[PDB]
Scaffold this active site. Structure first.
Site, PDB file in Angstrom:
ATOM      1  N   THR F   1       0.853  -1.224   0.000  1.00  0.00           N
ATOM      2  CA  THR F   1       0.000   0.000   0.000  1.00  0.00           C
ATOM      3  C   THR F   1       0.870   1.247   0.000  1.00  0.00           C
ATOM      4  O   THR F   1       1.750   1.394   0.847  1.00  0.00           O
ATOM      5  CB  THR F   1      -0.935   0.048   1.230  1.00  0.00           C
ATOM      6  OG1 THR F   1      -1.855  -1.053   1.185  1.00  0.00           O
ATOM      7  CG2 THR F   1      -1.718   1.371   1.282  1.00  0.00           C
ATOM      8  N   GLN F   2       0.622   2.139  -0.956  1.00  0.00           N
ATOM      9  CA  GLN F   2       1.289   3.436  -0.993  1.00  0.00           C
ATOM     10  C   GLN F   2       0.268   4.533  -1.272  1.00  0.00           C
ATOM     11  O   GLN F   2      -0.943   4.310  -1.209  1.00  0.00           O
ATOM     12  CB  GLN F   2       2.401   3.484  -2.062  1.00  0.00           C
ATOM     13  CG  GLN F   2       2.930   2.146  -2.560  1.00  0.00           C
ATOM     14  CD  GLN F   2       2.113   1.603  -3.720  1.00  0.00           C
ATOM     15  OE1 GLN F   2       0.888   1.520  -3.637  1.00  0.00           O
ATOM     16  NE2 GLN F   2       2.785   1.239  -4.809  1.00  0.00           N
TER      17      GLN F   2
END
Ligand SMILES: [Mg+2]
Lengths: 212, 235, 222, 244, 250, 233, 231, 240
Positions: F1-2
């Protein structure tokens, strides 16, 4: 959901409703909440439908492997404990299960094990699981005797599901009956609650509150 | 010394060829396939009279529709049977159906060549795998430690195999009844066995579509032996 | 935070006849209030006279259908080109779905075909693999709009025979493929009127002993 | 590949013997003699250091007798370095048991554990066995005073009196001759030293060629004391018993 | 690849001999003579700097090595095997002791750790024994001064005085006649130099002889002042000049 | 996740009678900061495919390298690398689609929306979409981000269904695309005036147009607009 | 001699005897023929039985809709290698929506066999394979040796007495390559080719195994009465 | 890890390492098992080459696997401990999961399985041990006696012997044991077991160990004097 199973003179009665809901939406009225593990063992389906289905047919595979290796019918104690030990490994992961493992063997006689996704494994005479369990317990507790006939025991299980089906919003559809003997379980039909209710109301004089 | 997975100059795996010699020393096992069923029979060959012969288990159930007979180093067969049973049950779990006899046999044979420097040597046991499925009917397979399996109408493995196979060559036809096959196995076992054949030193079994795999009682086999003796004295 | 799931809308419908089965689905694909495609096939011929649709999150839907089609291929390789029966396919799909029990395929899967006796069969799955053979099953966005109609018009629920007044039920007479297709079309026309995610086109796959046939119908594009 | 150079330490001979175990036992037969004698009121451990020098620092030296815990000690015969590997493992087992059950490890349980480790090296791993034989002298409240021996095979047995190392045939005959069941520690001390004095390959038995220990309930009241004898104390007991 | 030699290369022969250990001891026997003598107030360890070539700078090759501030080591046999053992001995003094107890190990326990490493090379898979014998001299508070020998087998013995390598048999006899329990450190150094002269053929001076002592604390070598309890290392390597000074009084 | 950092906005595209058109502006935004003005977001693969990418630019550059690596790899031990066994749009898409869905399934997505535009060996138009979720779909017109909301409605007036594709010429299609780009410049706060446009035609091949500008803009009517209700001056 | 104990050892003349011994296992195997035209590619295989009660060992394996092979030698090794091909064919389809080129399939088989010849502990594959397929560059026929050597050919044969069929194909080269759009005539040429490798025995109904792939023909195997037409 | 294939086939189809493991069993002290009508008796030889032994603490030849099953052996003593430990662990594991103690056959099948595994696993040699496993199944009064050997084959026996001179005592048992009428009492069964060992043992002093196992976890080891009374009575009848 409403599922029950109780021991008596003639073996075990297993009775379940048929309704499956997603919130207020009635997804199905024709759900099978009795898993036929094998011709001698039955399991009830409450909580997670997939979790019960998947792991109890798996249990059937384990029971089959047992009797191939040991050349002997698996005990209800052993069969139930295979399931309970399995779910206990998954404890925390989010399995949802409330089931009665029901069977009738030589060494044990009629035996019922309540198995739970928290790892609970209880032997007992009367069990009742689901959103409508309290309603079914009432009918059971007040009418249960060990010396019930197979005919009367079947009706009691049917009537107790009806009691739940009526009151509990998340129970209904139809009633499935099973009678577990030493030589195996015997299916005793699907009974639509809609038709059953009116039939029981008239013949029994119960449900006077309801206009028919 | 030399590799376990070494090829000979003739293009054969030494260890596989040597395990085949161990199987030749094994007790005789015979299978006969008919359109009414497949019959499996074995020589028990107890090493002493004090050995309780009913504890000798050389015929084994894999599933309700698949049976198995062994010859050679019978201890090696236990893990093969275990795998077979697991494969049969697993396939039923995944596909809600019986597994094909060939597919089961293939799964067993995949273990065979998994040896090297996996297990340390090939299996020292041959298997006669008999069964029934809806697609190909009654079937008899011969599973070797080479990983090769042949389907057979009839097959003998063990110490009296080449003599028994020559006898099966003459006796087998496509219209054999189950009863005819039972006697035929008993006849050929009696021929190749050192000791005199009876219900305690030999064992019969069969697989039918209706009743599935069944090992025969010593009382049931005894009657078939008595029926055999009389029909041979009949001419 | 990253959300691995999405809703591609759509609505599917499976109905099992006496010697046939239909699996229908709208061809509209959406996110939020936008249309991605007015024609994006959702119901697939998977071979062996089996049709399948995995409605909901289209990426998981496409992944599952792909993996099942693959499973059919390998079933042939491993088991001497044996035909995968609808009941066996159903059990196989359960394991595919339950394989991702703790990170599920966000889809409501339905398959259709014929059972080993040649009768019509429809199987219905939840996202995590619990399944059941059914006669009639709508899935997706407008499922709640369609199923009550089907209870009434296929199973004749709450319908009684005139004159008897509730004493005799309307008999459950068998429907032809032409009769089923009418009910499918009217289900989707009604769903299109009252559900924003339903429209554009209707694609029906009909399964018989002769094989798989396709029928396409226009739906309102608003 | 590598197979060419493999001795195969864990195989049977045609006669059904373990080559390396047998050869390790041959190694041990050249090691200094160690003797254990069990009495009613204690245990004696006596052992001969191998051809020493006058420049060897004896008072800080330890090649034969080792402490496993406060209740159990061992006499070593064979490769000292191998023994120390096993001794440290044994000391740790005794402490693991004490931590787990809050009770001192029973003598046999410790002996079995070490003997099982030796066994492993004869059945798997392809490594050479430990060229060591132990005499275990110990006490617990179940069986009281106990003498054991283990050898490279991993086989262990219980004894009233026993020898390991060199001249065990001669030593075991002498012990079998003069040992009695009602014997006491002071008598066993004398027997142990007399036996070594006769079986030794040296010209004479002196204090600088010996290690000596006693496990006695000769500790103030119901408890057990281990005494590893000092060079001067071994010299005194040699004069007392009339050997020098 | 992978180390496929997972089996022992040292094994018992029918006679009960561990061949590779014996052969390692044979390699030690060929090695240059080194010795150790223990006095009442110190220990001395010494060896010959056998220079392989006169172009080689023999000062860069240290046969006598500091293990801890109070422990030193010298060897006979294969130099490279010694060098790696010194590296391991230094590290193990920290990892398995100083980082636990906040102090340097006593001589006997460090020796024990070195012995363990040598023992493992005698039993572990796909290795040969170390072809060196070590003489380790050291001091610690509770055991005082000590001198230990460590063989390829992993066996170790404490000594009052001893020698290893080429002319050990003759040297040990020489030490037996001279050694007593009343020697001062200077006397032990004097005896060490006498003993070592017998086994040396060519040049005998401070540049061809390597000699170190374990003696008094050296606060001048500590590198800092301010902590009373820290009084400096007891290990000190004698200089080329310091050796030559004592060779005049020889 | 970014979270996406440097981002590219709308990619728009449509089918016409002989092929496909795709376009995307040359801006790399850093939130509201219009940081990088010379970013090419249309990446051609061979002479038959153009991949248009929106979203995170660092992930775009990674994808760009995968495609470059894909061409290299396809040429290995391949005598027909520039003929029968050349990369097809359908191969390039399916590969990307696999990667995108795998990456979302590891909870570490390539933060992009991608449109693969090209022409197949048999002359068939290829136009398909894939994004960070691994969601895929095809349509006569396809657009990412703001384009989906504003470009598609305009492009769908030209090609409203499959049967309109043979009736649409390259001049009409390009006109509609260029107009859509102008509309996005009026209304998308994260767009730029400069853009690139690529045409992949089954007859004339790949035509790649750089340094295009939005022109014929209407602003004059702004002079008459005064205040926010009651103000006259 | 001293250099045949394992696959990791070159002989003094630079030979790998274990590989050559694995090659020998193919020669012992039953004959199988491969040949192609511009439209179709055909496999013909003589199946071998243990005795008269036994079945005839299957020789042909399908790898994809457009590819398959015939085997000669150790059948289990062919199962391993065919399984590997099935996966590589399948990987190409799933990931790239692309049918695996027959030439690339050969490259993969070569490399898989090669690793078994350079490493200790393992052994070479004891089987030879004839891969036919129809891809984007038309019909193809490959010959795989467990040494690693894969060769693209118009026609070939491997197994016992394969030289007779190989010479026949070498003569018929100009004829059978031109058999385009006629599957039956191409099979006839293959059946006539494999007949040159027969002695004592002849082609019966459960003896013969034929496979074909082509332009509008999925890889399909013919056994039993389906090959009686060609006997 | 050490992966060397020690147990391998020879040209004549023999696995010598398994056969040499049997030679280790041949060297081991004699063990005998005899089952009566309502009991099983395990007899074991103690070689009298070792005196000055402490018999209190010295490992006894018969070991309890559970309260209802026992295991005796012939061959390598150190090896036997590993099989005994594994068996004891499996017996408790069985009780834990199945909620029922092991059958004698099951326990035998497990031990035999372990032994087999060591005949085709890399880097290990076979067990130089044959075992006699005896006892009574839970809630069952039928006597059980099984034998295992290094190869991993196992079988049931009315009576059996293993170890050195087992050929001789098997000879004795084959003529003296009647299947139609097995030793009806504990006395008769113990007597026949002692008699069979007396064919081989030497002195009937501390050289014979006897352990009697009866149904419902009733296991007891006979003392020196109790056995000595059997030894006395046997030879007094023999003097005739
Ligand atoms: Mg709508």
């Amino acid at each position: 959901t409403t599922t029950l199973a109780f021991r008596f003179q003639g073996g075990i009665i297993v009775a379940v409703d048929s309704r499956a809901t997603a919130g207020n939406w009635v997804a199905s009225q024709t759900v099978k909440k009795v898993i036929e593990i094998n011709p001698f063992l039955l399991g009830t389906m409450a909580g997670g439908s997939a979790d019960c289905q998947f792991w109890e047919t798996w249990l059937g595979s384990q029971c089959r492997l047992h009797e191939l290796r040991e050349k002997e019918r698996i005990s209800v104690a052993a069969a139930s404990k295979i399931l309970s030990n399995l779910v206990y490994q998954y404890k925390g992961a989010g399995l949802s299960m409330g089931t009665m493992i029901c069977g009738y063997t030589r060494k044990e006689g009629p035996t019922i094990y309540y198995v739970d996704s928290d790892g609970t494994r209880l032997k007992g005479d009367i069990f009742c699981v689901g959103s409508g369990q309290t309603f079914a317990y009432g009918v059971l507790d007040s009418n249960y005797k060990w010396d019930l006939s197979v005919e009367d025991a079947l009706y009691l299980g049917k009537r107790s599901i009806l009691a739940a089906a009526h009151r509990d919003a998340y129970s209904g559809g139809s009633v499935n009956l099973y009678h577990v003997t030493e030589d195996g379980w015997i299916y005793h039909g699907n009974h639509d609650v809609g038709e059953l209710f009116w039939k029981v109301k008239e013949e029994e004089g119960s449900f006077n509150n309801v206009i028919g | 010394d030399r590799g376990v997975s070494t090829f000979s100059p003739e293009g054969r795996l030494f260890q596989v060829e040597y395990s085949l010699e161990a199987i030749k020393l094994g007790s005789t096992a015979i299978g006969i396939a008919t359109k009414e069923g497949v019959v499996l029979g074995v020589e028990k060959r107890a090493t002493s009279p004090l050995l309780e012969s009913d504890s000798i288990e050389k015929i084994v159930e894999i599933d309700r529709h698949i049976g198995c007979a062994m010859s050679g180093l019978t201890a090696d067969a236990r893990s093969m049977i275990e795998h077979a049973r697991t494969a049969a049950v697993t396939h039923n779990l995944y596909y809600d159906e019986d597994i094909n006899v060939e597919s089961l046999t293939q799964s067993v044979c995949d273990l065979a060549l998994r040896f090297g420097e996996l297990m340390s040597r090939p299996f020292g046991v041959a298997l006669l795998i008999a069964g029934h499925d809806a697609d190909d009917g009654y079937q008899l397979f011969h599973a070797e430690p080479s990983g090769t399996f042949y389907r057979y109408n009839a097959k003998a493995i063990g110490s009296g195999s080449e003599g028994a196979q020559a006898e099966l060559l003459n006796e087998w036809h496509s219209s054999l009844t189950l009863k005819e096959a039972e006697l035929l196995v008993l006849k050929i076992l009696k021929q190749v066995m050192e000791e005199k054949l009876d219900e305690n030193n030999a064992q019969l079994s069969c697989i039918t579509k209706q009743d599935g795999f069944k090992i025969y009682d010593n009382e049931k086999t005894a009657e078939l032996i008595k029926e055999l003796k009389e029909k041979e004295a009949a001419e | 935070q990253f959300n691995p799931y999405g809703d591609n809308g759509g609505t599917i419908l499976g109905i099992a006849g006496e010697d046939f089965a239909v699996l229908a689905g709208d061809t509209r694909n959406i996110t939020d209030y936008s249309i991605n495609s007015r024609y994006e096939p959702k119901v697939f011929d998977c071979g062996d006279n089996i049709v399948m649709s995995a409605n909901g999150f289209a990426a998981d839907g496409d992944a599952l259908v792909k993996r099942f089609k693959n499973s059919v291929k390998w079933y042939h390789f491993d088991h001497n080109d044996k035909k995968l029966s609808i009941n066996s396919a159903a059990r196989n799909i359960q394991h595919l779905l339950y394989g991702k029990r703790f990170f599920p395929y966000y889809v409501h899967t339905i398959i259709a075909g014929l059972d080993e006796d040649g009768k019509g069969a429809v199987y219905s799955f939840d996202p995590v693999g619990s399944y059941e053979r059914e006669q009639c099953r709508a899935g997706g966005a407008a499922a709640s709009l369609i199923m009550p109609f089907l209870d009434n018009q296929v199973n004749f629920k709450n319908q009684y025979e005139p004159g008897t007044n509730g004493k005799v039920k309307k008999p459950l007479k068998y429907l032809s493929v032409e009769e089923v297709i009418k009910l499918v079309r009217d289900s989707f026309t009604s769903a299109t009127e009252r559900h924003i995610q339903v429209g554009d086109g209707l694609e029906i796959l009909i399964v018989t002993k002769d094989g798989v046939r396709k029928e396409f119908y226009e739906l309102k594009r608003d | 590949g590598s197979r060419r150079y493999d001795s195969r330490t864990t195989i049977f001979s045609p006669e059904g013997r373990l080559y390396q175990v047998e050869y390790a036992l041959e190694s041990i037969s050249h090691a200094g003699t160690a003797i254990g004698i069990m009495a009613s009121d204690g245990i004696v451990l006596a052992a001969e250091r191998k051809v020493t020098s006058t420049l060897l620092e004896q008072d800080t030296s330890t090649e034969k007798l080792y402490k496993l815990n406060d209740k159990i000690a061992v006499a070593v015969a064979g490769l000292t370095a191998d023994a120390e590997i096993l001794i440290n493992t044994a000391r740790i087992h005794a402490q693991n048991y004490l931590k787990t059950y809050n009770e001192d490890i029973p003598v046999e349980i410790l002996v079995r554990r070490l003997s099982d480790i030796k066994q492993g090296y004869t059945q798997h791993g392809g490594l050479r066995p430990f060229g060591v034989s132990f005499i275990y002298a110990g006490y617990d409240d179940r069986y009281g005073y106990q003498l054991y021996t283990s050898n490279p095979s991993g086989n262990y047995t219980g004894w009233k009196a026993i020898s390991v190392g060199a001249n065990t045939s001669a030593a075991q005959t002498l012990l079998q001759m003069d040992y009695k069941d009602d014997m006491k520690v002071d008598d066993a001390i004398e027997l142990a030293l007399k036996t070594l004095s006769k079986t030794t390959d040296s010209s004479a038995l002196t204090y600088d060629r010996l290690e000596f220990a006693t496990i006695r309930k000769g500790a103030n009241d119901g408890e057990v004391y281990q005494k590893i004898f000092k060079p001067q104390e071994i010299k005194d007991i040699l004069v007392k018993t009339g050997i020098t | 690849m992978t180390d496929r030699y997972s089996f022992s290369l040292t094994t018992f022969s029918p006679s009960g001999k561990l061949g590779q250990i014996d052969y390692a001891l044979t390699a030690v026997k060929q090695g240059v003579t080194s010795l150790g003598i223990k006095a009442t107030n110190g220990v001395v360890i010494a060896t010959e700097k056998k220079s392989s070539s006169p172009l080689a700078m023999s000062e860069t090759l240290s046969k006598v090595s500091l293990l801890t501030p109070d422990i030193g080591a010298v060897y006979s046999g294969m130099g490279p095997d010694y060098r790696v053992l010194v590296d391991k001995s230094r590290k193990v003094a920290h990892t398995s002791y100083k980082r636990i107890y906040g102090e340097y190990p006593p001589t006997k326990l460090l020796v024990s750790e070195v012995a363990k490493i040598m023992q493992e090379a005698t039993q572990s898979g796909g290795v040969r024994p170390f072809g060196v014998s070590l003489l380790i001299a050291g001091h610690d508070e509770f055991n005082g001064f000590s001198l230990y020998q460590v063989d390829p087998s992993g066996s170790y013995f404490p000594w009052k005085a001893t020698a290893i390598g080429k002319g050990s048999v003759a040297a040990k006899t020489f030490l037996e006649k001279r050694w007593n329990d009343e020697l001062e450190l200077e006397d032990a150094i004097h005896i060490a130099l006498l003993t070592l002269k017998e086994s040396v053929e060519g040049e005998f001076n401070g540049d061809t002889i390597e000699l170190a002592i374990i003696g008094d604390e050296n606060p001048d070598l500590l590198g800092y002042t301010g902590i009373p309890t820290d009084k400096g290392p007891r290990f000190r390597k004698l200089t080329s000049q310091e050796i030559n000074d004592r060779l005049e009084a020889l | 996740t970014q979270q996406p950092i440097v981002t590219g906005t709308s990619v728009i595209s449509m089918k016409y009678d002989n092929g496909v058109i795709i376009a995307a502006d040359n801006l790399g935004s850093y939130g509201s900061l219009l940081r990088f003005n010379g970013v090419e977001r249309l990446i051609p693969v061979g002479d038959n495919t153009v991949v248009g990418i929106s979203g995170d630019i660092s992930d775009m550059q990674h994808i760009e390298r995968l495609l470059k690596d894909l061409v290299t790899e396809n040429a290995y031990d391949n005598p027909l690398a520039d003929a029968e066994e050349a990369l097809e749009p359908s191969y390039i898409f399916e590969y990307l689609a696999t990667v995108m869905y795998q990456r979302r399934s590891k909870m570490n997505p390539l933060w992009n929306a991608i449109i693969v535009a090209g022409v197949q060996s048999n002359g068939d138009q290829f136009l398909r979409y894939v994004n960070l979720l691994g969601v895929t779909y095809s349509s006569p017109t396809l657009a990412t981000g703001f384009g989906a909301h504003m470009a598609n409605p305009l492009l769908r007036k030209v090609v409203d269904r499959e049967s309109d594709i043979p009736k649409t010429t390259v001049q009409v299609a390009e006109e509609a695309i260029v107009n859509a780009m102008r509309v996005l410049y009026y209304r998308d706060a994260r767009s730029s005036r400069n853009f690139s446009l690529a045409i992949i035609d089954k007859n004339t091949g790949l035509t790649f147009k750089k340094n295009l500008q939005v022109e014929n803009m209407k602003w004059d009517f702004a002079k008459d607009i005064k205040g926010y209700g009651t103000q006259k001056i | 001699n001293n250099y045949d104990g394992d696959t990791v050892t070159f002989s003094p003349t630079g030979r790998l005897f274990q590989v050559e011994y694995a090659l020998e296992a193919i020669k012992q195997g039953s004959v199988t023929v491969g040949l192609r035209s511009n439209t179709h590619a055909v496999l013909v295989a003589l199946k071998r039985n243990a005795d008269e009660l036994s079945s005839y060992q299957k020789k042909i394996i399908k790898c994809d809709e457009h590819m398959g092979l015939s085997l000669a030698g150790l059948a289990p090794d062919a199962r391993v290698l065919s399984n590997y091909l099935r996966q590589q064919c399948n990987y190409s389809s799933l990931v790239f929506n692309r049918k695996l080129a027959v030439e690339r399939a050969g490259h993969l088989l070569c490399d898989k066999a090669q690793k078994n010849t350079q490493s200790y502990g393992g052994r070479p594959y004891g089987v030879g394979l004839l891969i036919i397929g129809y891809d984007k560059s038309g019909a193809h026929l490959l010959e795989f040796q467990p040494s690693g050597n894969v060769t693209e050919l118009y026609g070939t044969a491997i197994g016992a007495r394969s030289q007779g069929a190989k010479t026949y194909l070498e003569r018929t080269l100009d004829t059978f390559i031109k058999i385009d759009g006629n599957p039956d005539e191409l099979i006839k040429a293959g059946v006539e080719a494999i007949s040159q490798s027969l002695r004592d025995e002849s082609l019966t109904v459960d003896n013969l195994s034929i496979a074909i792939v082509g332009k509008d023909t999925p890889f399909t195997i013919y056994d039993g009465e389906a090959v009686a037409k060609y006997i | 890890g050490y992966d060397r294939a020690l147990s391998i086939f020879s040209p004549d189809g023999h696995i010598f390492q398994v056969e040499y493991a049997l030679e280790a069993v041949k060297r081991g002290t004699c063990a005998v098992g005899v089952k009566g009508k309502n009991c099983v008796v395990l007899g074991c030889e103690r070689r009298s080459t070792l005196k000055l032994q402490d018999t209190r603490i010295t490992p006894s030849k018969v070991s309890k696997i559970d309260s209802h099953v026992v295991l005796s052996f012939s061959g390598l003593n150190a090896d036997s401990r590993i099989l005994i430990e594994k068996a004891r662990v499996e017996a408790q594991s069985h009780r834990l999961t199945l909620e029922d103690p092991v059958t004698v056959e099951y326990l035998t099948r497990y031990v035999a399985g372990v032994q087999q595994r060591y005949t085709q696993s890399g880097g290990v040699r076979p067990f130089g041990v044959s075992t006699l496993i005896a006892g009574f199944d839970p809630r069952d009064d039928e006597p059980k006696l099984y034998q295992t050997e290094p190869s991993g084959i196992y079988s049931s026996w009315s009576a059996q012997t293993i170890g050195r001179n087992s050929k001789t005592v098997r000879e004795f048992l084959e003529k003296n044991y009647d299947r139609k009428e097995p030793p009806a009492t504990v006395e008769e069964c113990v007597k026949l077991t002692v008699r069979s060992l007396l064919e081989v043992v030497q002195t009937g002093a501390k050289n014979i160990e006897i352990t009697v196992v009866k149904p419902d976890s009733d296991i007891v080891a006979l003392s020196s004097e109790e056995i000595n009374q059997y030894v006395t009575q046997i030879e007094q009848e023999k003097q005739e």
